[PDB]
Design a protein around this ligand. Structure first.
Ligand SMILES: O=P(O)(O)OC[C@H]1O[C@H](OP(=O)(O)O)[C@H](O)[C@@H]1O
Ligand SMILES: O=P(O)(O)OC[C@H]1O[C@H](OP(=O)(O)O)[C@H](O)[C@@H]1O
Ligand SMILES: O=P(O)(O)OC[C@H]1O[C@H](OP(=O)(O)O)[C@H](O)[C@@H]1O
Ligand SMILES: O=P(O)(O)OC[C@H]1O[C@H](OP(=O)(O)O)[C@H](O)[C@@H]1O
Ligand SMILES: O=P(O)(O)OC[C@H]1O[C@H](OP(=O)(O)O)[C@H](O)[C@@H]1O
Ligand SMILES: O=P(O)(O)OC[C@H]1O[C@H](OP(=O)(O)O)[C@H](O)[C@@H]1O
Ligand SMILES: [Cl-]
Ligand SMILES: [Cl-]
Ligand SMILES: [Cl-]
Ligand SMILES: [Cl-]
Ligand SMILES: [Cl-]
Ligand SMILES: [Cl-]
Ligand SMILES: [Mg+2]
Ligand SMILES: [Mg+2]
Ligand SMILES: [Mg+2]
Lengths: 321, 321, 321, 321, 321, 321
């Protein structure tokens, strides 16, 4: 029943042709949007049927980043309230297309505000170390530079997908001086790092931060040197389920993403490659979290969950049936 | 004025076609041996003049690993003694060809011992994490595997030169099961690690270990989980000058080992690739150093030095002048 | 003036014939019920007298666990609200038997949900270590095991009262495999422990956990090996006066509980036996607290306090004239 | 255009003839009150124009302590409300003279409460170490002394302004025994210290304490010995802008407060005296903050902010324009 | 072939009728004496047989404390030196009864001097906490008290064998005031402890201390509150094979020592009792070791090893054919 | 019997008119020298009598720095050997005058060598933080600068004697840029410090360093930031007695050295000033010790004691009788 452009967004999400917790969330919301502008269902209850089907597909692309499930919870939720009210086919159609834009928009805005708030923590002459490719982190960095602050960013490689290359090339485009190094070099240059700025895919109620593999290692050595570790993440990066005791699943991706298939098939079969895409960073190695609602201590993650998600506790996923 | 096989061996030490602190030291010894065998100098003074130019060449290949200079000192020091003692042309030649053989032979026996001694610390059912590629480290693991001890080794990729592919392929051939992960997975799988066994290129009098880049990071999180970190290294890995306040220098290799020339030239001028080949591990993160002389705590490195190189302090390099 | 039952439930609390913060709080609530239930007051102003009397009697049984003065407050606070409004004799006898019914019921509920939230934190294969005997702790593990999760619990003896035996047997009844070990062995077996789950008798606003003696020791070594420490406690375990700066009193039980008097008489005058009933575990050694309201970081204890005990603070204990 | 007693009070805040975050805030409030009482403006707009110039003067005395701007915001914010509400000349005057009195009066009551609450944490026989001179800190100690609690206070010299001589002379007058030592003795006598009680000038949303220079050092070694570090500070010591990512600036006072002009001029040009008046204490070294609203963990500072200054974020300074 | 006495001293070691590393080592030496003393061998090659037999019998009593195979080595090593030289029947019977006399004597001496050196570390007024029952520990405290130093010792019960009772009583005999507390209370009373003195059963080359179960826990919390941890041990407590990489075996005593079989039979099949007799205390938790050769940092254990056991290593246990 | 110039050196030592562990040691040796050049005793046994009397006087000037007792042990010892041989009056007279010079000379030399060895650890562009006034530390610093290295030194004030002023003015004379700050500022500027270099008065066998008050605090925060702490101290700064369990006494000086008498007599008598002149820094906060015999890990302090003082163990002070 699901349109084709929806199956495409979903595929590009599990192949990481489209990646990054914030972008995936928007693309998810943009999937639903397209499903509503291109739906053929002639009846409303059937339209609502397709949406729930398109939502389940999106949800199942990649597990770890809650941004995806949250974006789904935003659009699908309003769509549900509208449905259980008496939304006529063309009415729900708009409510969804609307709620879809609304989200894709507050995301764009949330990044600017995270940029403004975190950029005040960056001091002139500061050297920043980061990991992976985070729009949020980059926002904090890019904004600081534009305020006239003189910085230099140490970009870690970020294997196995070489995400450091995106950060390096992007950051260099804004004019900012970059220093690219291998992951293992993180503790070697930590002594000359002033601040550490990274993003997040999911943040647990107790302050734990799940981010691209290797983040935990960087935060560990960062604490050891007394360097700040600021995580730049929107409020939709926080995991509501987490507060119910729910454990956030660390996605395991395909091995040929680490060692190319044509080279891997050459290897002795008693050698096995494990490719975890994220890891967990303890709240004590995190000094602050920069959200579009202010700087907050890790442990204050429970406050964000209560005020923005007093919804998820009561029901199932607005796309279940 | 020196033999071709000497300049070509020197060359491989620089291109790293020949690597590993131990193998480089032994290759160094072997070069002096070839220079003594193929030398066509009809006069002893001329000959000795030829040995010093070959030792001066080998010495200036790569700086970090003391194993190299110590192998040179071992051979050259005996040569000086004899030469000063008015040695014949053939006599001196003999002294050198025997000092080389002797070193190379002891180096190999040292690997065997470090193996037995280290292996007694690996218990049946142990999951061992390693880094880079170390003949010494592998000895400990191969030996344990051959006493019937069922173990599993987690091999970290070790960028930028993919040294982990070496260790994995090698350890596998002995049957040992291998788990291959990216360096950034170090802390993620550190909770399921029982023993950490790594090698070294140079060890300071205070017990500081200079090993492949990323070693210190693994060691950092290892202490964090109360997992023993054991460094398998021969006595000639200890740095004698260190005791005179000299710092070990960290080799900075070409940027194109991280990012290939083809693609690097593509990057904007404001991006810089830094490539340290080693890092330092404080002595408190090192539980024990396994040497052919037996196990010792990091802080005892001074005892090893005062013993072996008790005169490698004032006597200027025996290949100087 | 008080009924017989009240006086003896108070006595069974004082000698631990009935123990365990939770069970103690209900026993106390039940007691107040029996007073209002079996009373013979022939006036109301008199009834409310022999209520503040039986409340204050119970309050003075043991001091560490707030669960007791908290349950007490819950029933009395409703009686006082009623009474001071013009409660008829029989109106009040109902208000009370009711409030006592709900707390007892609510308590039984709370354990169910804590069990459910906590179990989601226990992964299949996990070796859990516990201490003392706590219904909240047991509930989390018991729930996990019935979910299909194959676990194995290390139970610590917990002297002087051998409370560990009450835990081992019970967990054993449920078919859960157990490893019984002496308190002292906590650090020796922490290396093989995955999670540590323990109850609580009182939790402070800053998140400090007051639990059976020896708890802070286990928490300490767990942080050392980076093993999650999860305290399971109902909201009525949180101390409200702890916010106005009060300190939790640590009960000092009779020495003959450690050394049987038959023997203690044999001992010299200069040997003194001190029997702390509990100890204090800092918030930094507690990763999360499992309540019937969800999982929270130890520093969010203030949220639970403000939320459940906002009223209590400005008023005096309702059982005080 | 503003009153003399305003410029002279502003002056003392700069010469530190009037110091202490609390006293400065109250003196600030008092100045606005005098400006309202002595103002001779016959027109309201003129009057309001006069109040803003006096608030702009007071604000630019010393930067670090937010108490000052918060006292200004308290008075000025009410003034703006009324003024915008078309207040009379006498009406506005009235609004201001009452906002000042009100603040000054609450500040004093806040000191009393912080006293009772903090004192409950000091036990009989306690040896308390302090730093600098804090009315808030002293309240906690004077109160404990007056509940019969026999205590001893170790007063640290607190250079460069010898603020410790103040605390010592003051605490002594209440009878309390005092041990006076140099700041550098902090760790030496820290082993015999039971409680650390210090004040503060500003507290960040993450619970970072900005207090007199040397505070962080004492706090560092305090954690090292497992000695509680308690910061006694009023709610208006918490920094609202902090939540928007703004860093608190550390005032750099004249070099001649460290080394006198007479002797300083003697020193060679290549010597520089740096004089930070404050330093930062991470939130993990702070056990609890004692406020008039009760005790709270460092990480809860955000709750205090969201409460008190819930609108002190967007509303530009009420004395701007 | 062995005498009766030897077999029963071995039996009393196996059931701890005789325990305590030191006492065990002498009992073992005495035994060898009784063998050579009460033997009836009518040949020498036969004598030396029934010596290696009674030595190997004793060696196989308990494994943790090296003091046993160390005492054994001391007597046998002298016999073997003699014998293999051409020892007459009676010559050897003397060599032995002699070597056994000296070790026993030397041991008694060693405690005296350890007591003397250690007491100089105990200041008047000091509250010392101890664990288990150790003659070396008791000697240091007993000496201190007789020097005039007014001390007060906190004795930990030390389950499962209640060994603390043996300590409390003894220290009490000497007039030393004692505070008896349950193992679990270690952290609760560490705040009032000045020094911690405990014995040892084996000490490794890197300085790790193997002592009664629960020792590593006390050491851990002591470092936490920065309280000196002093291990008192004679040179024969240091493990020599620990240098060739061997690991100290931790004895696993019978479960009925924790739970009386009368009861243990009542317990379900899925409850298993594990009884570790010792645990391992890392060198970083040991500040100093008191030996009859002076005070040394835990990392100097290698000095003591090389100095007293240089010979032993290249040879096989002298009691092995 | 003692000459007058001896009573003067001694007085200038207890009034610190002459201070610094290294200088005091030399002045002590120079006292004995003068006592020998100006002695009137006509007989040798009487001369030897006066020397022992002059030595006891010197020994009793100031307690903490072993440099004093060691210098005494050097001159007085040779003088004793000479005496018990048959030294004639004019012979012992020279032996002493000789041994006196010898020491005063090797001290001057030992400082140069400490300068050379430690200066190799200082890197160009490095910022050095120090404490008090240490010739040894200054040697390491001054030498580095002269080797052309670009440094900047952060000189802490060092109360109560304002010793920082000597370091500042001296270091500025060599041309080196200095930054003078109060003690409390130590943790504030530790973030921008690259190396920490301080001297020592006494070093215990286990690596503990006793130095000017406040040193321990600086080392603590130095460890916390991962900055090196190098202690520059001659081998005569090591405490031999220490190895015998001996505790090094922390001198307590007169209060009017902290607060001028004319101002102190004004103070309330229930205020008491404590003036400890040194404190103890743990071996774990010390990375290396630079001695005239090489760089050594703290824990290697026992090696220095054995090789340079195998004398003190056997006898009393060479000036007792
Ligand atoms: O949402 P933004 O801020 O862009 O990036 C947030 C995080 O999500 C990404 O995960 P992945 O690359 O999608 O697997 C990275 O780990 C990144 O740090
Ligand atoms: O000597 P073995 O034990 O073989 O290995 C010693 C160390 O030398 C190597 O450096 P590189 O690869 O030569 O640059 C690796 O870092 C390895 O750990
Ligand atoms: O409420 P539940 O979870 O049942 O027990 C909570 C705590 O109360 C008990 O104290 P005590 O035995 O009453 O002295 C134990 O310490 C236990 O951990
Ligand atoms: O407000 P109260 O509690 O009195 O003291 C608060 C803090 O303000 C002072 O700074 P300054 O002396 O004004 O520069 C001190 O640092 C003191 O700790
Ligand atoms: O040699 P001494 O100091 O007497 O005792 C040393 C150690 O030996 C004992 O073990 P066990 O009781 O034999 O199992 C105790 O653990 C004690 O600490
Ligand atoms: O011997 P040098 O290196 O000069 O200084 C060594 C140490 O001795 C001094 O003590 P004091 O000033 O004499 O009390 C200082 O504490 C200094 O750090
Ligand atoms: Cl990835
Ligand atoms: Cl190779
Ligand atoms: Cl109990
Ligand atoms: Cl003032
Ligand atoms: Cl036992
Ligand atoms: Cl001084
Ligand atoms: Mg830095
Ligand atoms: Mg909160
Ligand atoms: Mg040594």
């Amino acid at each position: 029943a699901v349109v084709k452009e929806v199956l495409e967004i979903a595929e590009k999400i599990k192949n990481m042709e489209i990646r990054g917790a914030g972008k995936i969330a928007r693309s998810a919301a943009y999937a639903l949007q397209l499903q509503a502008e291109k739906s053929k269902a002639t009846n409303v209850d059937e339209f609502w049927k397709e949406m729930k089907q398109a939502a389940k597909i999106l949800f199942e692309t990649r597990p770890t980043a809650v941004s995806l499930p949250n974006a789904l919870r935003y659009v699908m939720h309003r769509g549900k309230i509208a449905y259980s009210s008496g939304a006529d086919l063309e009415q729900l159609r708009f409510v969804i297309i609307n709620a879809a834009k609304e989200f894709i928009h507050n995301s764009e805005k949330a990044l600017e505000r995270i940029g403004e708030f975190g950029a005040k923590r960056i001091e002139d002459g500061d050297v920043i170390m980061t990991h992976s490719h985070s729009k949020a982190a980059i926002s904090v960095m890019k904004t600081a530079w534009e305020q006239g602050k003189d910085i230099k960013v140490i970009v870690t490689e970020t294997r196995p997908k070489w995400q450091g290359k995106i950060t390096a090339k992007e950051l260099a485009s804004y004019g900012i001086p970059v220093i690219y190094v291998v992951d293992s070099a993180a503790r070697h240059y930590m002594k000359m790092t002033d601040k550490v700025v990274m993003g997040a895919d999911s943040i647990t109620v107790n302050g734990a931060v799940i981010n691209k593999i290797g983040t935990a290692l960087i935060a560990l050595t960062a604490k050891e040197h007394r360097v700040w570790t600021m995580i730049a993440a929107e409020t939709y990066k926080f995991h509501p389920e987490t507060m119910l005791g729910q454990l956030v699943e660390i996605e395991m991706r395909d091995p040929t993403e680490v060692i190319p298939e044509d080279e891997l098939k050459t290897w002795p079969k008693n050698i096995e490659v494990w490719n975890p895409a994220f890891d967990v960073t303890p709240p004590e190695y995190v000094d602050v979290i920069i959200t579009e609602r202010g700087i907050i201590p890790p442990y204050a993650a429970i406050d964000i969950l209560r005020e923005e998600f007093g919804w998820a506790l009561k029901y199932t996923e607005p796309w279940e049936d």
